[PDB]
Design an enzyme around this catalytic site. Structure first.
Site, PDB file in Angstrom:
ATOM      1  CG  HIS A 226      -0.569   0.368   2.449  1.00 55.10           C
ATOM      2  ND1 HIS A 226      -0.319  -0.473   3.517  1.00 55.10           N
ATOM      3  CD2 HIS A 226      -0.406   1.614   2.905  1.00 55.10           C
ATOM      4  CE1 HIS A 226      -0.022   0.268   4.575  1.00 55.10           C
ATOM      5  NE2 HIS A 226      -0.110   1.550   4.221  1.00 55.10           N
TER       6      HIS A 226
ATOM      7  CD  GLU B 197      17.675  10.244   6.160  1.00 61.05           C
ATOM      8  OE1 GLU B 197      18.209  10.836   7.141  1.00 61.05           O
ATOM      9  OE2 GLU B 197      17.351  10.763   5.071  1.00 61.05           O
TER      10      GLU B 197
ATOM     11  CG  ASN C  44      16.435  15.412  11.954  1.00 60.82           C
ATOM     12  OD1 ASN C  44      15.711  15.615  10.976  1.00 60.82           O
ATOM     13  ND2 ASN C  44      16.365  16.165  13.045  1.00 60.82           N
TER      14      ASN C  44
ATOM     15  CB  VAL D  77      19.154  17.411   9.893  1.00 64.07           C
ATOM     16  CG1 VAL D  77      20.604  17.902  10.094  1.00 64.07           C
ATOM     17  CG2 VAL D  77      18.126  18.364  10.518  1.00 64.07           C
TER      18      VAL D  77
ATOM     19  CD  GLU E 147      22.063  11.754   6.148  1.00 67.56           C
ATOM     20  OE1 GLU E 147      23.304  11.863   5.992  1.00 67.56           O
ATOM     21  OE2 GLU E 147      21.371  12.380   6.971  1.00 67.56           O
TER      22      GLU E 147
ATOM     23  CG  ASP F 188      -0.003  -3.829   2.783  1.00 70.64           C
ATOM     24  OD1 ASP F 188       0.471  -3.434   1.703  1.00 70.64           O
ATOM     25  OD2 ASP F 188      -0.263  -3.098   3.810  1.00 70.64           O
TER      26      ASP F 188
ATOM     27  CG  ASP G 119      -1.008   0.749  17.132  1.00 69.28           C
ATOM     28  OD1 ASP G 119      -0.342  -0.145  16.557  1.00 69.28           O
ATOM     29  OD2 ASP G 119      -2.204   1.070  16.842  1.00 69.28           O
ATOM     30  CB  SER G 120       3.006   1.179  14.068  1.00 68.29           C
ATOM     31  OG  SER G 120       2.100   0.142  13.684  1.00 68.29           O
TER      32      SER G 120
ATOM     33  CD  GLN H 282      -2.886   6.784  10.264  1.00 68.99           C
ATOM     34  OE1 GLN H 282      -3.006   7.284  11.387  1.00 68.99           O
ATOM     35  NE2 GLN H 282      -3.489   5.657   9.920  1.00 68.99           N
ATOM     36  N   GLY H 283       2.363   6.749   8.538  1.00 69.85           N
ATOM     37  CA  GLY H 283       3.724   7.163   8.293  1.00 69.85           C
ATOM     38  C   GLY H 283       4.737   6.088   8.682  1.00 69.85           C
TER      39      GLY H 283
ATOM     40  CB  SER I 234       2.521   2.279   6.172  1.00 66.98           C
ATOM     41  OG  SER I 234       1.317   2.584   6.822  1.00 66.98           O
ATOM     42  N   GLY I 235       4.870   0.117   6.094  1.00 65.58           N
ATOM     43  CA  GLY I 235       5.928  -0.446   5.267  1.00 65.58           C
ATOM     44  C   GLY I 235       7.176  -0.788   6.092  1.00 65.58           C
TER      45      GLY I 235
END
Ligand SMILES: [Ca+2]
Length: 223
Positions: A40, A52, A54, A57, A62, A84, A171-172, A174-175, A177-178
């Site tokens: 999704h 990563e 931050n 920044v 990275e 999914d 919980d986990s 939105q954002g 996900s994956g």
């Protein structure tokens, strides 16, 4: 992540951020050229961001690498969220060191009661909205199949499991996900769905990665 803690920079070295101008989903590095995420989370124009902390920044560890190919699971159903899962190949191999590392795939599924680490840059509030810049973590157990199905009647497939706390507050969201659910050093789940975030009797629902290892390995072998 609601109700978690600040992981520490690069302490979760397999955690990736998927970026299309902005962070939009998590993923897990499973070898130097492949990332697993949620189906999704699919879109075009993905840059994978490794190493990563931050996300706003440049801190020095990275690696930014464009996706060359995305593969949504053959049987993904976006209405039910069954299957999914998706694979992303990187245009070049990541450099692996202590701060950027692959996570082992399971040889065996996980059971209810096992503690796991869930991580991401998702919303930290269950009422209202606040997105962190640094990576957040939560330790949470896998829940029984029965309590999963009781929480979400008629919605849990054999490719899903619940983890978290029925009391609410952790919980986990939105954002996230994956992103990863890692148990005893193995990638057991992908952040998939849930009713709201950290609500009582509405735990997190995760893609059951152990069902997909055959598909993952054969896909990597031929792409
Ligand atoms: Ca950064």
């Amino acid at each position: 992540i609601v109700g978690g803690y600040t992981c520490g920079a690069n302490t979760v070295p397999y955690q990736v951020s998927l970026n299309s101008g902005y962070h939009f989903c998590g993923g897990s590095l499973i070898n130097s050229q492949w990332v697993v995420s949620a189906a999704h989370c699919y879109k075009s124009g993905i840059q994978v961001r490794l190493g990563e902390d931050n996300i706003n920044v440049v801190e020095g560890n990275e690696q930014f690498i464009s996706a060359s190919k995305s593969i949504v699971h053959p049987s993904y159903n976006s209405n039910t969220l069954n299957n999914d899962i998706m694979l992303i190949k990187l245009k070049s191999a990541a450099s692996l060191n202590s701060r950027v590392a692959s996570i082992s795939l399971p040889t065996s599924c996980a059971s209810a009661g096992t503690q796991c680490l869930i991580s991401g840059w998702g919303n930290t509030k269950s009422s209202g909205t606040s997105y962190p810049d640094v990576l957040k973590c939560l330790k949470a157990p896998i829940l029984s199949d029965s309590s999963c199905k009781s929480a979400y009647p008629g919605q849990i497939t054999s490719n899903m499991f619940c983890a978290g706390y029925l009391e609410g507050g952790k919980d986990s969201c939105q954002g996230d996900s994956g992103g990863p659910v890692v148990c005893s050093g193995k990638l057991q789940g992908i952040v998939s769905w849930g009713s709201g975030c950290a609500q009582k009797n509405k735990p997190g629902v995760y893609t059951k990665v152990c069902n997909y290892v055959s598909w993952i390995k054969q896909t990597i072998a031929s792409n």
